[PDB]
Design a protein around this ligand. Structure first.
Ligand SMILES: [Mg+2]
Ligand SMILES: [Mg+2]
Ligand SMILES: [Mg+2]
Ligand SMILES: [Mg+2]
Ligand SMILES: [Mg+2]
Ligand SMILES: [Mg+2]
Ligand SMILES: [Mg+2]
Ligand SMILES: [Mg+2]
Ligand SMILES: [Mg+2]
Ligand SMILES: [Mg+2]
Ligand SMILES: [Mg+2]
Ligand SMILES: [Mg+2]
Ligand SMILES: [Mg+2]
Ligand SMILES: [Mg+2]
Ligand SMILES: [Mg+2]
Lengths: 132, 55, 103, 101, 129, 99
RNA sequence: GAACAAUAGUAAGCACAAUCAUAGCACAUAAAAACGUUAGGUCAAGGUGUAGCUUAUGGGUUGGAAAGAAAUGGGCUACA
């Protein structure tokens, strides 16, 4: 059996997002891509750094936003600026949300020494594609 | 205190020009988008997932 | 405060944080003010050296090498040829013992 | 904290290999030349031999960045196959798809 | 919008060639529609072609420890679009390529080759040493 | 071949800025030696690892400063809490062996 | 717990099938392959539960290894 990135069949009650309900072999068929940047194209450089950056952005976004992160984090990279798109649950009040928005944008622009832009879209409950 | 305010599609004039609402490069916020759009591989129900909260 | 996304871009670009368009990959790097005949022709620093000796063979290959090199500015090339002068004159004994009189 | 002591010593090998680099290049310039005397070459030999062997290029080992795995490393992504596959399968790796032909 | 006219004789381009690289087809299709419609408005007179796709395939071992009869095969496809502009100016070039470049999608890269028209250099004109 | 060919080639050689006087194939390496960027200097080499001290310390700080949140470190912590509360801890240095 | 001139079975879920990829079809191959089985493999990818080491089971330098009496699996090159 192939165990790569999959969600096993339960008694049938297990809530599942469209993202985790599709096996790796579906990527580019049905599944899109989580990260978007130039680096893996035919003639191009520094894919590695965009990858390190990606990883740390996963870690950072999941540790900065405790319990409220809904679905896996969408990374866009355009004209040197990173557009970080996150689907996030409604947990905390708007004050802390904008606090952490500004906080994150500042710290990420300044660590990566490049302009960062953060887009949050709030969702009532985790999106369920299958089961339930 | 739980806050739910209706999306921009509710306040939008039918003929209001688009470049006003979408001047620059954007994430595609579903709320500000007047056009219904269904993506995602259908379940056997026959429903492509809505334009709302779609990852 | 921001009136538009264009205001965002505009301010980022004045600030020098946003990139410059249409992009030239050489934007922000002036290369010390140098020109090709300061790069290509290294005769200037070959002035002090024995002229007909094999030291000119070795230093002409070093020169022709530092000429073909985009990866280094004027300064470091010069430090190379200078370290070579300093080391060649550092040992006077070897050059003379080897069987060729070398200056 | 670098993930291992392995990655510690190899990082110090990258710093060092950057440091004595000029020395390397200039000494090995004469040492590899035919026209010059053999006598400048024996002395140049003792010279690059004198350098700390931690600063030489080939003592450096390519490892996966995060998981430190010495082998099975993909040069372009600096990532071990375990971690590569892990990342690409979640689709966290851009453009990488499963090959069918 | 501050505009200024310098007396100096603005650069001419015979052929401005723009390579648009991508993974996906759709984005490059749309972007093609974009560059075409943008270069029509400015009366730039352009063509577009599709350079044949290039596919790289490399293989990793499927398991953590040992099964060498079992392999995973991963793929990277690069698809092409090339815009060919003929007989344009330097300013028209800077503007059109500014507009085309600022909006360039995240997954796609762009390589531009400009062949620029120069009459002759000065020491060559008609002296002989 | 001719002397006209040798002189023509020397002309092209000294003109273009390439190697002028005839050399060994061996010595030519030194040409290519300064013609390139040496291996150990390349950014794709010395910059191989991102600084781990940086990310580690930065995120830990941000944690204790109450910005970032590490569930791994919380698992660890809580488990050493239930390890020492049990009485099997990490011995104060120097004490364990001889006593 | 099925019988179609049908006798107690209905069931969304997940496999297989269907579609995708192999630059048009069709085929083929590729992929896909649930549930469980073999306490199958790996604490040396990494991460951890339990136990241990903490002037050491830790961290560094330097030098040293991988020798064939055989026995055999797989290959390459042949015997023209
Ligand atoms: Mg199998
Ligand atoms: Mg090696
Ligand atoms: Mg087909
Ligand atoms: Mg078939
Ligand atoms: Mg198969
Ligand atoms: Mg199938
Ligand atoms: Mg099957
Ligand atoms: Mg066993
Ligand atoms: Mg372990
Ligand atoms: Mg442990
Ligand atoms: Mg030890
Ligand atoms: Mg040793
Ligand atoms: Mg036998
Ligand atoms: Mg054969
Ligand atoms: Mg054979």
């Amino acid at each position: 059996k192939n165990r790569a990135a999959r969600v096993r069949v339960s008694k049938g009650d297990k809530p599942v997002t469209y993202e985790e309900a599709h096996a790796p072999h579906y990527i580019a068929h049905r599944k899109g891509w989580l990260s978007l940047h130039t680096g893996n194209l035919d003639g191009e450089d520094h894919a590695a750094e965009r990858t390190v950056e990606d990883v740390f952005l996963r870690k950072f976004m999941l540790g900065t936003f405790p319990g409220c992160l809904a679905d896996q984090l969408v990374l866009k990279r355009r004209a040197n600026q990173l557009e970080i798109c996150a689907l996030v649950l409604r947990q905390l009040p708007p004050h802390k949300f904008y606090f952490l928005v500004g906080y994150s944008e500042t710290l990420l622009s300044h660590f990566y020494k490049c302009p960062v832009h953060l887009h949050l879209q709030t969702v009532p409950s985790k999106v369920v594609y299958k089961y339930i | 205190r739980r806050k739910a305010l209706p999306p921009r599609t509710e306040k939008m004039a039918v003929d209001q020009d688009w470049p006003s609402v979408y001047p620059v490069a954007a994430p595609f916020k579903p709320s500000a988008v007047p056009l219904p759009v269904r993506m995602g591989y259908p379940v056997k129900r026959g429903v492509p997932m809505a334009k709302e909260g779609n990852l | 405060p921001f009136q538009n996304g264009f205001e965002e871009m505009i301010q980022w670009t004045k600030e020098g944080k946003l990139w410059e368009f249409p992009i030239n990959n050489e934007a922000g790097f002036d290369d010390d003010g140098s020109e090709f005949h300061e790069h290509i022709f290294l005769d200037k620093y070959l002035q002090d050296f024995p002229k007909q000796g094999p030291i000119r063979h070795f230093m002409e290959l070093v020169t022709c090498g530092l000429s073909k090199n985009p990866y280094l500015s004027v300064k470091q090339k010069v430090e190379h040829i200078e370290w070579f002068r300093n080391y060649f004159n550092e040992k006077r004994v070897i050059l003379k013992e080897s069987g060729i009189q070398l200056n | 904290y670098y993930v291992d002591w392995k990655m510690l010593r190899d990082v110090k090998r990258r710093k060092m290999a950057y440091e004595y680099a000029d020395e390397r290049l200039r000494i090995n310039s004469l040492r590899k030349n035919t026209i010059l005397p053999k006598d400048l070459q024996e002395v140049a030999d003792e010279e690059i031999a004198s350098l700390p062997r931690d600063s030489c290029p080939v003592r450096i080992r390519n490892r996966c960045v995060m998981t430190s795995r010495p082998r099975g490393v993909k040069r372009r992504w600096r990532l071990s196959r375990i971690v590569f596959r892990h990342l690409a399968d979640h689709g966290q790796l851009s453009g990488v798809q499963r090959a069918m032909w | 919008p501050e505009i200024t006219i310098s007396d100096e004789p603005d650069t001419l381009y015979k052929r401005l060639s723009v390579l648009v690289k991508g993974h996906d087809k759709a984005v490059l299709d749309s972007y093609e529609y974009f560059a075409v419609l943008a270069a029509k408005e400015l009366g730039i007179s352009i063509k577009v072609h599709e350079p044949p796709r290039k596919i790289e395939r490399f293989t990793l071992l499927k398991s953590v420890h040992i099964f060498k009869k079992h392999r995973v095969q991963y793929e990277m496809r690069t698809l092409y679009r090339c815009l060919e502009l003929e007989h344009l100016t330097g300013s028209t070039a800077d503007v059109y390529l500014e507009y085309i470049q600022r909006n360039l999608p995240e997954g796609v890269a762009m390589e531009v080759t400009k062949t620029k028209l120069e009459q002759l250099p000065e020491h060559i004109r008609k002296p002989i040493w | 071949l001719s002397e006209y060919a040798v002189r023509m080639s020397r002309l092209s050689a000294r003109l273009f800025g390439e190697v002028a006087r005839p050399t060994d194939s061996k010595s030519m390496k030194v040409v290519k030696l300064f013609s390139e960027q040496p291996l150990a200097k390349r950014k794709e080499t010395y910059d191989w690892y991102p600084n781990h001290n940086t990310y580690f310390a930065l995120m830990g700080t941000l944690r204790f400063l109450g910005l970032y949140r590490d569930e791994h470190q919380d698992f660890r912590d809580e488990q050493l809490r239930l390890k020492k509360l049990r009485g099997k801890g990490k011995p104060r240095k120097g004490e364990g062996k001889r006593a």
